[PDB]
Amino acid sequence: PDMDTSFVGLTGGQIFNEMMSRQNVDTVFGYPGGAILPVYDAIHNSDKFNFVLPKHEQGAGHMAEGYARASGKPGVVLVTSGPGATNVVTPMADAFADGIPMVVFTGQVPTSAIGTDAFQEADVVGISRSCTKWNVMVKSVEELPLRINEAFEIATSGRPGPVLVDLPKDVTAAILRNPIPTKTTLPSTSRAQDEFVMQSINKAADLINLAKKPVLYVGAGILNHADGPRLLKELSDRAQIPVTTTLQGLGSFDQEDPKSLDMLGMHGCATANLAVQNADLIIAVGARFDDRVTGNISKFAPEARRAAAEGRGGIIHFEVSPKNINKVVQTQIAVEGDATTNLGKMMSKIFPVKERSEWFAQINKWKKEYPYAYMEETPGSKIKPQTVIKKLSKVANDTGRHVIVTTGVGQHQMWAAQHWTWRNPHTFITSGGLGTMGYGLPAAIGAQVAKPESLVIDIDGDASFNMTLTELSSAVQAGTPVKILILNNEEQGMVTQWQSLFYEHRYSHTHQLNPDFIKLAEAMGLKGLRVKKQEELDAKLKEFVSTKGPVLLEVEVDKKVPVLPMVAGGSGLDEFINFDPEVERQQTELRHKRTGGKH
Amino acid sequence: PDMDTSFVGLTGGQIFNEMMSRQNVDTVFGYPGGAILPVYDAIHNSDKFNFVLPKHEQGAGHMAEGYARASGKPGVVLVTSGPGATNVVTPMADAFADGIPMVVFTGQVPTSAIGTDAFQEADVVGISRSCTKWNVMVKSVEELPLRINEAFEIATSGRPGPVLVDLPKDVTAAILRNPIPTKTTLPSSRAQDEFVMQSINKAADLINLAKKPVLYVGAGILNHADGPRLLKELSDRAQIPVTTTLQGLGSFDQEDPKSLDMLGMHGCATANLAVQNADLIIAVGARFDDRVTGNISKFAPEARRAAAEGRGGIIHFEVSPKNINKVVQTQIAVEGDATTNLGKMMSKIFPVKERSEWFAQINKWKKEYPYAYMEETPGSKIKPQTVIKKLSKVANDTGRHVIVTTGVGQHQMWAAQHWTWRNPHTFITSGGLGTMGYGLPAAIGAQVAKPESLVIDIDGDASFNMTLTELSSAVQAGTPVKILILNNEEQGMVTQWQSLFYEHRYSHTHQLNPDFIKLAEAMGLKGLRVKKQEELDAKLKEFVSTKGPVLLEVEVDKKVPVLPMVAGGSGLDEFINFDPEVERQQTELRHKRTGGKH
């Protein structure tokens, strides 16, 4: 084994510093602690990268995710042992669900104290086993470079995800006394395989060229390659195929394009859902058929399954991970690998399509029939959440700046998804798989660090905001001019919505006492704005976006407004609840009675 | 009968409600979520117990711990799946380290969706395996009563600890269609009893033979209502000096002349010396962790010789056999509940007249190595230690029951050192895991447990930031907690270590703080601040007197080291002491190395 002596003499901590440089890391989010001190002393005043300090490790994790989402690079986290480590479990679980590249370094007690119920000791490798693509505890400093390189490679390959490297204090404080393999200190296809993939591509092209009512079901995977959107559009334009995206796919397709069906799924656009239930061929690109998208699985894509049975269609799946191939529904053709790459190889085999009048006409009728309708403002009423999104979307867009939107979890999140006009990739950063409330703020901060020149807006919910509102000061300390928008309905919207629907309006502990958000913002060091009256919304939104420096804008919005359309329970994607002003008014009455006038 | 049907017809959620009643649960801390909704609908407006809502599940967990610590009852947590569950990992790990009784119920996706990478699904049982005494996923509603009972029993027996019960939505929503064994619904040795007796005997002999005996007491003594009482008895009967661990504070009255105070890396010098010179160490409810033993090979040197010459050594009253002879080899091991065995051993103890020789040496140390520090000079900043002493008196002079919670760091050590501990179950601090942010949420839980008590949270600025959002929860729950922030605008304990071991190189140990007073006001509490020495007394009195929750920020002197200190490979007797000169020279050294920034 060829040896390297360049790290000989350095401490684990110093080697760590050098590896961050070699891994092209320009930002690290962390919080110091005793066990990890050897590494902190090493990166003290280091100019190899910028360090962002949160008030809580969970903040660090979510900042790393936001950063990764906006930059495309893996988010690096550096925390101490014990509580410092357990505090980043949620962010890891979150990054694991949404496939976000993240390398988490957790300090650990000295190897000689491990297993002795030592001070601030935790079985981090054990705890994080199920919420990381891979993890490891570095046994010796000689092993450090290697592990760091494996971590970054695993985190950024296949389906991106989080990895954890446990760093024992004695290992990071130790000095390298031995030369180590040159390989282990440097970063980073079968002919029959590529032969097999080309075969898959040909079969997929054959099916596409045969389809009469095709639909592109696009997900996050298309955004893991710079040319993803470009090729997706080319395919769409070439074969005249309408496109629908998941929550994590928004931004990949231009919603201004006539062929846009918008988001599909539980709270998706009726047109998109209808298109999916009636299509003879579903081309899934970088999407995992999760349960918030498929509706009742036995009712999913009936027309596509029928087409399959008749051998004239079905489902094509461009998936990068074998774990998600044929996991939820049986597919006819599975094109393994990087979606974008395979779309590029397949293009030339796709026959150019002149038009699909029938199909598009049907889709257009649904578009006229099922828009994202809702109860708009009326004289004297409170501001409507949906209206805020629509307006902010325009104001933000009219600035001509690059816009990135992050959100919390709940109704506001769904309305942001539905009513915002998505056009640019890597501009919507939201927690979908795990759905972590409190993701909004810290994610926005990370995103702003990744894209300093972008207008980063966090469309949050009051309950979600409370979870991590302490990072508000971090935004100030980090110099991230994030714009925090709070759609305040003084309730846990998404939950109350379910309680309204399935629990006869019995709201069990789903209404919390909020602090004065404006005074809070002021106390934290930001500008604070509030809006109650419809008349002032436009002015405030403009001041909000225009303000230089971090700013928080609270918008008092109407309460108990349900998010629609809605497919839940055993309903098929085409069996959605539609908005009805008459029914809303009826439900309202029924609510006041059932809650004894409480809500 | 053998079979019980008092549940047939009920939903898992309703059964859960009934079980909380049967388990004598009067408080539940939680946060709703989709997966756990069936249980929330069931406990809706339930009058079987009070529900406390935090802003974050971590808050719920720490509130449960504080509640458990102050009440003696297990803390019950109810959260949803996915993020709701992962958010209580830290509190569980914490409760696991300090042996706190806690039953955590986490909602889970329907059994039919488990393993499909379902919405808000997490392998909770897997994640929490290493930080819970036991955990389980309820497979069916028939199994619900059983699991709930096993959980509470395991959480409250042996060495208390946290347990987690995973509740699948389809299980809690399901209706019980089958009658279940009456036994399973009701809230639930050997001949080793001779070995214990033999031990209790040999220990009593060894104690009656000791010349320089020391009582090294821990949290274990507080796990029994008669612990403190029986501890004093033994101490008085055999005239033995008593030193307690951080988690032991409050089990022994520090007013008694036989009190050595706290031992350990930041413990009283006298306490450490006594331990190092003792021929016999009686360990009661303590696990010899590294923050106490110092350099293990240099620990209890005289106790060793006494052990080698068969005239003493180490006696250990431990409930968990796993912790016996885990750190240091003991001579006698009395298994079981410390309090119980102390009662059984009492009579076999010869009533000592006096130990004037031992006490002479001990009182010699007390006069020489007290908790000294650089006191306030004119115009200088308020000293953290002073605030603690002053508050200790003010709080005490109110005649109310006082409970103190803290964050993690220097302020925590100063609270331990300079407060005069006398009542059991009055100091609630995170020691094993040492979780910053524990202070506030713990105080809230403690206040819920003891409504009439004056609950004070002695926090640090950095620690406070971690969970400062629960400030509004305090208001919503109606818990008039008193939040004290010793603001040194730094991560004190870490800067102290950076000053000591890393040549005054403060790497990311200075966070930007918000306006604590405006923060408090925004959260709905009264906010007070103190900068001048002259106003400290007035503010402390107003602080304690204020009705309702209140926060007081006291600007204190920065870069103040917690002493004495036993770090690295130092034995408990090789501690660093306070020196006025040494400190002035250290300040100048810090100024030179930092250009003048610190």
Ligand SMILES: Cc1cc2nc3c(=O)[nH]c(=O)nc-3n(C[C@H](O)[C@H](O)[C@H](O)COP(=O)(O)OP(=O)(O)OC[C@H]3O[C@@H](n4cnc5c(N)ncnc54)[C@H](O)[C@@H]3O)c2cc1C
């Ligand atoms: C309250 C709430 C409501 C929600 N409502 C909806 C809704 O109505 N509709 C909806 O769609 N979502 C909704 N979501 C989000 C949902 O839970 C899922 O997180 C999301 O739909 C998953 O989208 P995705 O499959 O595109 O992305 P991912 O879950 O990230 O999956 C991407 C898939 O693409 C693969 N992949 C990754 N990279 C590549 C590559 N380079 N080449 C090829 N394949 C690749 C991955 O292996 C994976 O299988 C909601 C979330 C919450 C919290």
Ligand SMILES: Cc1cc2nc3c(=O)[nH]c(=O)nc-3n(C[C@H](O)[C@H](O)[C@H](O)COP(=O)(O)OP(=O)(O)OC[C@H]3O[C@@H](n4cnc5c(N)ncnc54)[C@H](O)[C@@H]3O)c2cc1C
């Ligand atoms: C910054 C910081 C500084 C610290 N500094 C110090 C210091 O200077 N000195 C110090 O002492 N601590 C210090 N600590 C706390 C320390 O880390 C340990 O948490 C603490 O000393 C453990 O005390 P304990 O053994 O009494 O309690 P535990 O750790 O709770 O252990 C109790 C033991 O008693 C047993 N037990 C429980 N119930 C019973 C029963 N009913 N009958 C019999 N046995 C029972 C248990 O099995 C266990 O072995 C510090 C913590 C932090 C965060």
Ligand SMILES: CCOC(=O)c1ccccc1S(=O)(=O)NC(=O)Nc1nc(Cl)cc(OC)n1
């Ligand atoms: C929290 C760090 O814990 C260590 O990793 C650790 C654990 C068990 C035994 C010895 C050490 S050690 O003696 O290698 N290191 C420390 O004890 N460090 C340490 N750092 C800080 Cl900032 C505070 C502290 O103690 C109160 N202790």
Ligand SMILES: CCOC(=O)c1ccccc1S(=O)(=O)NC(=O)Nc1nc(Cl)cc(OC)n1
């Ligand atoms: C978050 C709870 O998730 C469920 O446990 C879950 C998981 C996978 C598949 C079906 C369900 S389900 O159809 O039994 N329940 C729900 O889907 N519930 C649910 N509750 C809320 Cl408050 C919001 C929500 O969706 C946006 N969904």
Ligand SMILES: Cc1ncc(C[n+]2csc(CCOP(=O)(O)OP(=O)(O)O)c2C)c(N)n1
């Ligand atoms: C959640 C968490 N993150 C990091 C640590 C590491 N840590 C232990 S003590 C300490 C010092 C800072 O506290 P502070 O509240 O400012 O009080 P001080 O020590 O200054 O009195 C730190 C950062 C921890 N214990 N818990």
Ligand SMILES: C/C(=C\CCOP(=O)(O)OP(=O)(O)O)NCc1cnc(C)nc1N
């Ligand atoms: C409560 C909940 C979603 C949304 C609620 O409220 P919010 O005010 O933030 O937004 P709206 O829905 O009211 O807009 N689900 C459980 C949950 C608990 N805890 C965490 C960290 N994440 C979660 N998803």
Ligand SMILES: [K+]
């Ligand atoms: K849209």
Ligand SMILES: [K+]
């Ligand atoms: K004391």
Ligand SMILES: [Mg+2]
């Ligand atoms: Mg809300």
Ligand SMILES: [Mg+2]
């Ligand atoms: Mg501090």
